[PDB]
Write a protein that holds these residues in place. Structure first.
Motif, PDB file in Angstrom:
ATOM      1  N   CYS A 109      36.134  -2.248  32.599  1.00  0.00           N
ATOM      2  CA  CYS A 109      36.368  -2.926  34.047  1.00  0.00           C
ATOM      3  C   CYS A 109      35.545  -4.349  33.830  1.00  0.00           C
ATOM      4  O   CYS A 109      35.687  -4.826  34.956  1.00  0.00           O
ATOM      5  CB  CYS A 109      34.912  -2.424  35.035  1.00  0.00           C
ATOM      6  SG  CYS A 109      32.930  -2.358  33.564  1.00  0.00           S
ATOM      7  N   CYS A 153      32.603  -4.694  28.841  1.00  0.00           N
ATOM      8  CA  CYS A 153      33.552  -3.631  28.958  1.00  0.00           C
ATOM      9  C   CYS A 153      34.568  -4.270  28.716  1.00  0.00           C
ATOM     10  O   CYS A 153      35.430  -4.595  30.043  1.00  0.00           O
ATOM     11  CB  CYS A 153      32.977  -2.870  30.040  1.00  0.00           C
ATOM     12  SG  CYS A 153      33.912  -1.591  30.462  1.00  0.00           S
ATOM     13  N   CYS A 195      29.309   2.301  29.871  1.00  0.00           N
ATOM     14  CA  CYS A 195      28.944   1.066  30.285  1.00  0.00           C
ATOM     15  C   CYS A 195      28.266   1.139  31.885  1.00  0.00           C
ATOM     16  O   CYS A 195      28.057   2.102  32.274  1.00  0.00           O
ATOM     17  CB  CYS A 195      30.718   0.488  30.992  1.00  0.00           C
ATOM     18  SG  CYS A 195      30.601  -0.815  31.745  1.00  0.00           S
ATOM     19  N   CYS A 218      30.510   0.813  35.461  1.00  0.00           N
ATOM     20  CA  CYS A 218      31.393   1.723  35.173  1.00  0.00           C
ATOM     21  C   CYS A 218      31.009   3.267  34.573  1.00  0.00           C
ATOM     22  O   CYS A 218      32.539   4.133  34.969  1.00  0.00           O
ATOM     23  CB  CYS A 218      32.962   0.782  35.143  1.00  0.00           C
ATOM     24  SG  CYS A 218      33.815   0.934  33.111  1.00  0.00           S
TER      25      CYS A 218
END
Ligand SMILES: [Zn+2]
Length: 236
Positions: free
Chosen positions: A205, A202, A226, A229
């Motif tokens: 994050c 991701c 995600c 996050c």
């Protein structure tokens, strides 16, 4: 999906406007803090000038009052001297001696206090003068800076106006379910919340996706978030 690709392209472009607008608002607040810091430096100097002026006003009146009472004792001592020049009895002569001695000693005390007040006024006048100079120098050194700050704010406000109207012309043709998610994410994170897979992690994050989750994102047939996050993930 074709339509998902269009929804993404559209929210991506709104997202670029929102990022700029967040930046603009932060720089505005920073310019406003810089102005308040400048105003507060002047306001502090004005307060010192005001306190000094009120103190000078009190000295003026204590000085005037002291001179007046010194004058009054001086006239009274003169009256007593004239009286004594005419007295015949030793007791009256002596009473006048003693009274004049006492009156002179009180006068002496007042005169030394008056000297003290006059010296305080002289030093406080020097301090007032220096504080007025410092107020004028601070204002002078700062007026060009303040106006340049205010013009920057003006130009921020007017640029923010333009990015708002652009945001509104894109929101019209944007998928409203995705926008509704986007906007809550954005309010929460204050940075890019529709983000691509980079290096199989991701990019919001930096936590890696399971291969299954990457498979889901590639299908591009529903909104995938995600797992760590909660940002919206997309491919490419
Ligand atoms: Zn993430």
């Amino acid at each position: 999906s074709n339509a998902m690709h269009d929804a993404l392209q559209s929210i991506l472009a709104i997202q670029e406007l929102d990022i700029k607008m967040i930046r603009l608002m932060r720089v505005k607040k920073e310019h406003q803090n810089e102005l308040a810091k400048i105003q507060a430096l002047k306001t502090d100097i004005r307060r010192k000038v005001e306190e000094k002026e009120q103190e000078m006003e009190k000295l003026k009146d204590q000085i005037k009052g002291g001179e007046k009472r010194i004058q009054e004792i001086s006239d009274q001592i003169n009256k007593l001297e004239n009286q004594q020049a005419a007295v015949k009895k030793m007791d009256e002569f002596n009473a006048l001696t003693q009274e004049m001695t006492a009156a002179n000693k009180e006068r002496r005390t007042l005169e030394h206090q008056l000297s003290d007040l006059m010296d305080k006024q002289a030093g406080s006048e020097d301090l007032l003068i220096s504080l007025k100079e410092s107020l004028s120098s601070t204002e002078n050194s700062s007026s060009a800076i303040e106006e340049e700050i205010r013009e920057n704010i003006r130009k921020i406000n007017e640029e923010g106006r333009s990015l708002l109207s652009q945001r509104t012309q894109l929101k019209e043709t944007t998928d409203p379910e995705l926008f509704s998610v986007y906007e809550r994410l954005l309010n929460n994170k204050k940075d890019r919340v529709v983000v691509p897979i980079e290096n199989r992690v991701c990019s919001g994050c930096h936590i890696a996706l399971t291969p299954q989750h990457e498979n889901l994102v590639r299908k591009q047939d529903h909104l995938v978030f995600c797992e760590h996050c909660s940002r919206i993930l997309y491919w490419q």
